[PDB]
Scaffold this active site. Structure first.
Site, PDB file in Angstrom:
ATOM      1  CB  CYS A 194      -0.936   0.047   1.205  1.00 38.41           C
ATOM      2  SG  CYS A 194      -2.030  -1.382   1.322  1.00 38.41           S
ATOM      3  CG  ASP A 303       0.804  -4.378   9.613  1.00 40.90           C
ATOM      4  OD1 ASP A 303      -0.275  -5.013   9.582  1.00 40.90           O
ATOM      5  OD2 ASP A 303       1.291  -3.899   8.576  1.00 40.90           O
TER       6      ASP A 303
END
Ligand SMILES: CC(C)(C)n1nc(-c2cccc3ccccc23)c2c(N)ncnc21
Length: 448
Positions: A194, A303
């Site tokens: 991303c 994450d």
């Protein structure tokens, strides 16, 4: 006062020194901790060497079969490699008795197939070492020599030294940290994310590395730089080592190249189609081990998911991309929203209140467990991102995955407790996974 090389080392810069395994070196300057200035007694050449590639010439660490403080489990992962002949062995420090040693040996039996037998080596108060009191030895070396000629009551005669891979050096070279952009060549594109890409590459024309790039406008270089200082301090066999950075945008993060790729793709692969439970659990156990270190260091990953675990040889798994998420400046992402935020792995309090802790990582680990037992299937299969958080909030939890034993589903449910403090520790999860399959068999074969 000479040192000996434990592994081959290929030169990477103009000011370092190549050597072969077994080469005698003099350390002519040992002041710095991780790179020492050395001088080959064979070639006459001088240059810096990684201190972890050498040991004192007559020490026990110089012994090719001596593996030092290695767990019993890690010891088994090396010994059990399918290439190893029976009688492959190594000696390590005993965990359960301080100052004792352990001889680990690979064996084959019809009942058990391929397996590892451990023998505790005790040292006498009179000075000798023995497995069975019937026969003692003045050093570990002599013990090993005798048992390479005669089994004498061990499972198998000692045949081949357990092979290992070269350890990672600390940094790419002495004092190398913030490196110039032009020292990296990008070669093969490994992945796209991303906020950037990952590439296989070369540093300085010599060293194979992986390079992660960040889009300009992702995070400030000043914030990125302060954090990278924290990240380079994290050193653990189950964490992906960060090698070097280029702090100016576009930011580069240079790290070890893990050829087998992410756990997620390995799970979805032809590589994953026939992975059995025992292997899935062992990968889970390693990840918990990496995270348990994160946990001892009071750090937070933020994450954690199968995509950010990397696989190496012998089903080695390493935690990658730790801490970085905190620095993402994107508006939506900071608000825990948008098509780039991993909501399906995020604990409800972290998403609602921005409360990221080791406990919200424990929740992500629960989610990652469902990836391990479903070949990398996307969590919450019938839901889109924007409807997960509200479901989870109302107490929705994924059911036991098909073919997953209830016990591991129950573990997942403990990771998904509403109260973060009621969630288990990574230390607990590590032990629980390592000991998932109980063996009746003895920890150590009897001295007899
Ligand atoms: C699977 C995929 C393409 C996503 N990948 N990703 C990495 C990787 C993950 C996290 C931080 C890094 C930092 C610097 C370089 C690479 C990485 C990585 C790696 N080291 N080696 C091989 N593949 C990697």
């Amino acid at each position: 006062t000479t040192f000996v090389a434990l592994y081959d080392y290929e030169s990477r810069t103009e000011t370092d020194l190549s050597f072969k395994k077994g080469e005698r070196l003099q350390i002519v300057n040992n002041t710095e901790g991780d790179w020492w200035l050395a001088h080959s007694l064979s070639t006459g050449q001088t240059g810096y060497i990684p201190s972890n590639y050498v040991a004192p010439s007559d020490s026990i660490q110089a012994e090719e079969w001596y593996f030092g403080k290695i767990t019993r489990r890690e010891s088994e992962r090396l010994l059990l490699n399918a290439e190893n002949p029976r009688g492959t062995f190594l000696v390590r420090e005993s965990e359960t008795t301080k100052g004792a040693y352990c001889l680990s040996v690979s064996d084959f039996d019809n009942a058990k197939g391929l397996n590892v037998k451990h023998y505790k080596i005790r040292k006498l108060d009179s000075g000798g070492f023995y497995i069975t009191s019937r026969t003692q030895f003045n050093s570990l070396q002599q013990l090993v020599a005798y048992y390479s000629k005669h089994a004498d009551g061990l499972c198998h005669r000692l045949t081949t030294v357990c092979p290992t891979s070269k350890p990672q050096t600390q940094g790419l070279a002495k004092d190398a940290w913030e490196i110039p952009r032009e020292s990296l060549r990008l070669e093969v594109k490994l992945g796209q994310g991303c906020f950037g890409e990952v590439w296989m590459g070369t540093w300085n024309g010599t060293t194979r590395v992986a390079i992660k790039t960040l889009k300009p406008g992702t995070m400030s270089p000043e914030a990125f730089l302060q954090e990278a200082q924290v990240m380079k301090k994290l050193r653990h066999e189950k964490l992906v080592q960060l090698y070097a950075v280029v702090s100016e945008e576009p930011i580069y993060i240079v790290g070890e190249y893990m050829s087998k790729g992410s756990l997620l793709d390995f799970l979805k692969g032809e590589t994953g189609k026939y992975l059995r439970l025992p292997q899935l659990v062992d990968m889970a156990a390693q990840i918990a081990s990496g995270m348990a270190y994160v946990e001892r260091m009071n750090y937070v990953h933020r994450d954690l998911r199968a995509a950010n675990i990397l696989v190496g040889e012998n089903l080695v798994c390493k935690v990658a991309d730790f801490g970085l998420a905190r620095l993402i400046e994107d508006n939506e992402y900071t608000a825990r929203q948008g098509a780039k935020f991993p909501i399906k792995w995020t604990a409800p309090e972290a998403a609602l209140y921005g409360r990221f802790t080791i406990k919200s990582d424990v929740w992500s680990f629960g989610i990652l467990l469902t990836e391990l037992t479903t070949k990398g299937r996307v969590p919450y299969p019938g839901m889109v991102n924007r409807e997960v958080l509200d479901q989870v909030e109302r107490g929705y939890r994924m059911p036991c995955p098909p073919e997953c034993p209830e016990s591991l589903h129950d573990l997942m449910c403990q990771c998904w407790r509403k109260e973060p403090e009621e969630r288990p520790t990574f230390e607990y999860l590590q032990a629980f996974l390592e000991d998932y399959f109980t063996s009746t068999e003895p920890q150590y074969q009897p001295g007899e």
